[PDB]
Structures are given as structure tokens and as C-alpha cells.
């Protein structure tokens, strides 16, 4: 159980995520110590909101550290889908937090009343965005995007509460506007994660499939091709399965090798081709 | 765009889900009309909570109606994973609503003050639990479970607020207890959905795989078996891929037929077997 911490410290991304989680927890302790007093009306709410943020960060870190685990009998493909699941859960969490921020803005507009804790949170999340930057093999592409979207959403929420404080020297309007903005921002990541989880044909492979089918159909001995299935595994590993109907005397070796080469030139890493010998 | 409503009315499950969504929206209208007054402190919060419930119900209905769509070029396997995604999102939504209910209980305990609207919601959700009961092909197994878990969680929340009302003639304790209870209740569905989305070996197939491998290894001409991959598609369709190394003169037809029969007897519906002829 102790070796998990050292394994986390091995990778730089896990180290940055752990440092971020630790500093968020320290901020949680500071804000709850400040809120022990009677002015905790919105302090409890924003404390629970940043608890949700810490939970999302912990989930992302757990998925990132899990994704490097070796495969076994239970998980033939390994744990490379953990990053996709982390991206999906981060998108859903961002949507739900946008709706929660809209609800909190509505509550603040309805009920008149926190002014300096938001500044500290803005400092924390600007430090976070300063730390985080991006610009089978290599199964780490979505954790950075998810954490970046979450931290930018937190920064925009801090900007919105700062604007509300400036206004009081309407907050629901800016709150709902920023919620819609972050929802639109997270739409592409959510749709990409859904497409990955849908067993959908990879977007970068859809155009090349007709050309590959035409090329393999022209192979000598191949009669018919049927039951194609292509999907992404983690980020780029496209696991494609094919069924071929060849001549009763067709050379299976050459056809299999040519099909494998054709689909490897298209970017399909793992490929499974079944060659069926037609009856007359 | 109009034909979607008739398509929903075609299936009984979609009809029940649509009726439930319509009655939840009617309850939303009634409660907001009641809350237009100055006693909307907790009314806005529970209105947003049941808006979240309506959103989850709409997502479940959309996934259920999508899952019956035919496959195409973009989605080779179709939309049968929509039910698994709906189950996963319902589990995450239930967890987040449990945490939200805990937060609301904390707020109610901290801030002293809604007594009859909860009774109406209890009537609505008991009618819902009365309506809902359960006890490639057939791609509908998780929507009913997800909606049943959500409606039972709503009933338990109504029971908790009723208990709090009885107490006032501690509510945070019962709120957190019921939140933990519903989280534990939703753990099995969440873990099953994660296992489906993890490309994990199906739980009902794990035990039979060693026996199938031993049986296929005993086939004449088969030298080595490598790179096994089995996973569930929607609920029972197990898409398995296999690679075989056979003798240079082994009969590919008989080996392929025997492997297909062996894996079909184990419950693998769609199977892809690649036969490789070893060099000497």
C-alpha cells in the first residue's frame, strides 16, 4: 500500500497532479478554518464545490496512475481505457459544476448576503494554470486536457465572482453566461470521449477505410470482404477486425500479409484478419 | 424531427419513461408556481435537484431510443453501447446527487428555516416505483436498473426529509446515512458499467476461457495460441478475437470451424479467429 506513493512520484504528471491535490486540500483546510465563524453561508457551498474539484482531481490522478499498469487475464487490453473514462467523467463533472454554479448565482441573486477567499482561490488556480501546459504506447493524452479544462473553468468562476463583487462594490447573468461558455468549451472533449466509448470508427481512420477496402479487394484470390469493425483503444491504438472470403485455392499467407501491411500503412496497430475459404 | 415522438411511442419502455418525464416536468411547473412566493429558500434548491433528476431521465430515454438504431459506417457495432453509457452516467449522477443531498442536509442543519411539497414528491415517486418493475439482440438491460436506482434514491430522499420534518415537529445524520446507503446501492451497477467500458473480460466468461483454450489447444495441427482478447459489447454479446499458429500443412477449415464451435458453445456470439501458418 505504501509503494503506491512512490509509484506516483515516479512520473512527472502524477507528481504535478498530487501537488495540485495537496494544495487544494490545504486551501480547503484554510477556508474551513476561516468559515468556522458565522459568515459561512456561501463558504459551506463553495467549500463543497472545491471538494468536488478535489474529488475530480483525485479521480484523474487515479486513472493516470492506473493506465500504466500491465495487462492480465481479467483485462486483456490492459487499463488504457482509464484515461478515456477519466476524460468522460471530467466532462460530466464540468457540466454538473456549471449547472451548480448557475444555481449558486441564482441563489446569490435571490438572497442578499467571501470577498477575500475568492482572491486566494484565484491565486491558487492561476498558479495551477501556470503549472499545467501541453501546447499500447503513449497512453496519456486526455488527463492533461481534462485537468486543463477543469482549472480554466475554475479560473472563469473566480473571474465571475470577482465581477459580481465589482458589481456590488447582474451576477446571475454573468454566472449563466460563463456556465454556457464552459459547457461549450467542454463539448468537444465530451463528444470525443463518447465516440471513443461508442466503439465508433476512429475519426482519423474513417476516410482511409474505403481506400483500404478497395485496395484489399483488388488482391488476387479475395472474393468478398464482410463484417468490418474498427475502433480506438486509448488514443491512437486502432483495434480492427476483418473477415475475408478467399478462393478455394487462394494463398492464405500472401493475402494475410498483404492485408496486414495495407491496414498497418493506414495506422491500424492491432489487426485481426479471418480468412474463410469459399465453397466452390 | 416529428417522427422521433412516434418512434418513442412505439416501444413500451420509452412510453413509460416519457410519461415519467412529463409528470416530473408538470411537478416542476407546480413547485415553481408554489415557490414564486418568498418561501423559496429551499424550494429553488430542490427544484434544481429535481431538474437534475429530469435531465438524468431524459438522458436515459435518449440512450434507450438510440440503442435501437441500425448500424452504419461510422458505428460498425451500432449504438448498443448507449445503454452502458446511460448506466455509467446514471451511476455518476446518483453519486453526485448523494453528495448534493449531504450538502443540503448540512445547510439545513446549519441554517434554520416545503413541508407539503415533499409529500407530493413522495406521492410522485411512489407512483413511479409502482410503474417501474423488472423482477445485437435484446440490447436493453441497464436502463431499467438505472431508472429504478434513481427512483428508489428519490424515494429515500423523500423519506429522509419526512423524518427531518418529524424531528422538527438530527437531519444531517439521516441525510448522510441515506447518501451512504444509496452510494453503496449504486456501487454494483457502477462497477459493472466500468467493467463493460474497460474492455474487461466478461465476468460470466472468465471461468470458461481456460477450458476453451485447453480444448482448442488439443485440436490437431494447432501449435500455439496467442493474443486473446474478449470483451462485452452491450449486455451479452461477447466480441472475442483470437490468433492461432497452426502447422504448415494443417487444415485451416477444420481448425477454424472447431474453434468457432468451441467458442460459440461458451457464449461468444461474434468471434474473429486469425490462422497463421508457422514457418517449418
Amino acid at each position, epitope marked *: 500500500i505504501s509503494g503506491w506513493f512512490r509509484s506516483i512520484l515516479s512520473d512527472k504528471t502524477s507528481r504535478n497532479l498530487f501537488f495540485f491535490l495537496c494544495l487544494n486540500l490545504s486551501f480547503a483546510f484554510v477556508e474551513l478554518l476561516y468559515g468556522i465563524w458565522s459568515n459561512c453561508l456561501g463558504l459551506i457551498s463553495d467549500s463543497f464545490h472545491m471538494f468536488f474539484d478535489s474529488t475530480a482531481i483525485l479521480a484523474g490522478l487515479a486513472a493516470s496512475v492506473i493506465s500504466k499498469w500491465r495487462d492480465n487475464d481479467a483485462f486483456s487490453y490492459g487499463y488504457v481505457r482509464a484515461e478515456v473514462l477519466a476524460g468522460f467523467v471530467n466532462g460530466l463533472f464540468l457540466i454538473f459544476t456549471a449547472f451548480f454554479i448557475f444555481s449558486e448565482g441564482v441563489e446569490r441573486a435571490l438572497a442578499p448576503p467571501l470577498l477575500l477567499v475568492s482572491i486566494l482561490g484565484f491565486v491558487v488556480n492561476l498558479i495551477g494554470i501556470f503549472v499545467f501546459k501541453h501546447g499500447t504506447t503513449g497512453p496519456s493524452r486526455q488527463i492533461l486536457q481534462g485537468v486543463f479544462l477543469h482549472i480554466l473553468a475554475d479560473t472563469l468562476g473566480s473571474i465571475g465572482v470577482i465581477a459580481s463583487a465589482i458589481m456590488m462594490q447582474a451576477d446571475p447573468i454573468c454566472s449563466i453566461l460563463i456556465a454556457i461558455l464552459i459547457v461549450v468549451s467542454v463539448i468537444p472533449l465530451l463528444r470525443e470521449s463518447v465516440g471513443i466509448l461508442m466503439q465508433r470508427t476512429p475519426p482519423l481512420l474513417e476516410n482511409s477505410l474505403p481506400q483500404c477496402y478497395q485496395r484489399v479487394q483488388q488482391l*488476387q*484470390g479475395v472474393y468478398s470482404l464482410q463484417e468490418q469493425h474498427f475502433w480506438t483503444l486509448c488514443s491512437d491504438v486502432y483495434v480492427g477486425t476483418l473477415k475475408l472470403i478467399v478462393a478455394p485455392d487462394a494463398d492464405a*499467407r*500472401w493475402i*494475410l500479409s498483404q492485408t496486414h501491411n495495407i491496414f498497418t500503412q493506414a495506422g491500424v496497430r492491432q489487426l485481426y484478419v479471418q480468412i474463410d475459404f469459399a465453397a*466452390m | 424531427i416529428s417522427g422521433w415522438f412516434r418512434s418513442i411511442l412505439s416501444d413500451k419502455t420509452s412510453r413509460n419513461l416519457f410519461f415519467f418525464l412529463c409528470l416530473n416536468l408538470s411537478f416542476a411547473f407546480v413547485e415553481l408556481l408554489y415557490g414564486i412566493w418568498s418561501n423559496c429558500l429551499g424550494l429553488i434548491s430542490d427544484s434544481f435537484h429535481m431538474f437534475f433528476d429530469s435531465t438524468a431521465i431524459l438522458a436515459g430515454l435518449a440512450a434507450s431510443v438510440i440503442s435501437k438504431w441500425r448500424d452504419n459506417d461510422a458505428f460498425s457495432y451500432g449504438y448498443v453501447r448507449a445503454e452502458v453509457l446511460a448506466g455509467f452516467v446514471n451511476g455518476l449522477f446518483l453519486i453526485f446527487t448523494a453528495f448534493f443531498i449531504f450538502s443540503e442536509g448540512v445547510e439545513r442543519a446549519l441554517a434554520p428555516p416545503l413541508l407539503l411539497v415533499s409529500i407530493l414528491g413522495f406521492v410522485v415517486n411512489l407512483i413511479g416505483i409502482f410503474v417501474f418493475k423488472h423482477g445485437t439482440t435484446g440490447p436493453s438491460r441497464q436502463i431499467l436498473q438505472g431508472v429504478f436506482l434513481h427512483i428508489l434514491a428519490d424515494t429515500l430522499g423523500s423519506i429522509g426529509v419526512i423524518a427531518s420534518a418529524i424531528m422538527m415537529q438530527a437531519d444531517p445524520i439521516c441525510s448522510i446515512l441515506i447518501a451512504i446507503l444509496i452510494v453503496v446501492s449504486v456501487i454494483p451497477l457502477l462497477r459493472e458499467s466500468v467493467g463493460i467500458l474497460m474492455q474487461r473480460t466478461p465476468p460470466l466468461l472468465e471461468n470458461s476461457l481456460p477450458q476453451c483454450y485447453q480444448r482448442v489447444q488439443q485440436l490437431q495441427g494447432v501449435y500455439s495460441l496467442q493474443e486473446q482478447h474478449f470483451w462485452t459489447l452491450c449486455s451479452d454479446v461477447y466480441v472475442g478475437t483470437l490468433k492461432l499458429i497452426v502447422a504448415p500443412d494443417a487444415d485451416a477449415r477444420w481448425i477454424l470451424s472447431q474453434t468457432h464451435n468451441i467458442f460459440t458453445q461458451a457464449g461468444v456470439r461474434q468471434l474473429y479467429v486469425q490462422i497463421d501458418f508457422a*514457418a517449418m
Partner: antibody
Amino acid sequence: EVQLQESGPGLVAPSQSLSITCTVSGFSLTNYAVHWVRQSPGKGLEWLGVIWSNGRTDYNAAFISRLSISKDNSKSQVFFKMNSLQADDTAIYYCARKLAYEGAMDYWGQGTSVTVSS
Amino acid sequence: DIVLTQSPASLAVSLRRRATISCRASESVDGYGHSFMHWYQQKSGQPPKLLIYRASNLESGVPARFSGSGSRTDFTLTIDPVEADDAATYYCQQSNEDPYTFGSGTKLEIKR
């Protein structure tokens, strides 16, 4: 006792059509492929085309425009037709049975000397 | 097209000696560890006869004296021992890439 015999005209006028019928025996065309290879003193051996079990055929890139290979499984005969012959098309035309599940040809037949001249 | 070059063009080998014919391909013809190069023997006034398929497997019904190795681009057909009946023209043929191409023939002359 597998045999392949061709029956084609020895002399063909230039810019005419060549018809060669390769009658097979000892095996059925329903499960085997027959290749067509011509040999000339110049350019050496050259591959023309092949016809598969039910009728699918693949032609050489050079001759794809002016080639046509037919087959009739009932009479166990393979029809070979070329259009617009020239001087360099004079060669020895062989019909060869494709090896069992291999890219080579195992059994051949004594080709017919096709000479293109006026 | 894949051009196949056979060296030497003409070879003179004494009886009961060892004969080596090498076929070189412009491009690699290996597919997943399988070499798709085949050897043919054509005597005087006879159709070519298949000897070795896939560059390492003897066709059924040929004498065991014929041996063949090679991989990728360079291949080699070995006759040991060489008999008087082995005086013919040998062709190397590849089936890796459409169209099939036959290399220039190599004439084997028996020294006596």
C-alpha cells in the same frame, strides 16, 4: 494424370484477335485457378493473367486493355482472347494450373507457337 | 513491377559438383517471415517445371538434390550433386506483388 492442352491458331495476322482454348483434365476448374503465361525469345517469361474459381480474373497491367479470359466449368475449358496483336506478341503461350494455396504454378501444358506475321 | 536479376547468366558446373544460382529482387518480397519466391526448371523444348515454392519448400516429386535458401531480396538455388539431367534453364519467380514477374533465365552447362 493431370493435363492441360491448348488449341490455338499458329499463325495470326497483325491487328487481329487470338483465341486459345486450354482444355484441362484430371482436375476441376470449380476449385482451382488457371494462369496464363507467354514465353518469347525476347523479354523472357511473362505473366498475362489468371482466372479464379467462379469467374473472377486478374489481368496484367500492360495487357489489361486488350485481354479477355473466359471459362466454362461444365466442359472444363478455359478461353483466352487477345485483341490487336503485333510483332512483339509472337511467343509461346502456356496455360498453367495454380499450385494448391500457393502463388506458383505446378502443372503446365505444352504451349502453342503463336506467330504474328503477314 | 519487381525486376528479378539472376547471376550468373550462364553457369558451367562439372558432374557431381555443386551449382549455385542466385536471384536478386529490386524490392523485398518477404511477408510476415514468408519469402514469396519460386524457382522453375525448363529443359529444351519443354514447359517450365516447378522445383521450389516459397523459396525453401521442395515441390512434391522432385529429387532431394535441389535445395533453396534466401530471404528479403537475395535468394539462392543450390543443386548438389549435379547430374547430367539437370542441364536446363532455371527461372526465379516472385508472387509478392502483382503482376508476377519472371527473372532472366540462367543456363546450366554440364562440364565433361
